[PDB]
């Protein structure tokens with residue numbers, strides 16, 4: 001067949017009841033994740049190929065970067081809670097991987113301040129129990145699939161994207177193939 005279990009995707013052996021339809025995991029420490037966001041724009045190209053209004057969910061992970069990796073999962077929970085993901089994704093990736101100016105939780109906060117989130121608003125969110133619940137949710141979703149690498153994308157708790165089965169000689173063709181595979185899976 002054109003799409004085959006074990007080629008463009010693999011099938012979870014213990015599927016996850018009630019999972020987000022389209023669930024992406026990343027780390028701001030992850031070099032391929034930087035490529036996925038800043039160079040390939042995977043999440044945006046996937047969204048443009050799914051029906052209007054569908055739920056794409058994107059969660060950060062703890063297992064890269066030690067202490068700061070866990071701070072970034074909490075900061076990502078702040079970003080989700082305040083709805084400022086689009087304002088802080090680029091400066092966080094660049095601050096960790098390009099300029100290497102993010103070295104502490106305070107440096108992460110500066111990214112939000114510079115992006116126009118008020119200090120009191122950031123700190124209140126950082127310390128909130130709503131943000132604790134969002135951290136818990138990110139952790140649980142990664143645990144549900146025994147996640148040990150990023151970037152990763154899951155469709156309906158059932159299918160995991162397998163980009164290692166895709167020609168990457170042309171960036172645009174690769175992104176298309178990835179997006180079309182998500183569409184195909186979501187229609188399964």
Ligand SMILES: O=C(O)Cc1coc2cc(-c3ccccc3)ccc12
Nearest residue numbers: 032035036039151163164168171174
């Ligand atoms: O898990 C793996 O190693 C496979 C994989 C995950 O994300 C990728 C991105 C590219 C890429 C291609 C062109 C430009 C920039 C990045 C290539 C391969 C992979």
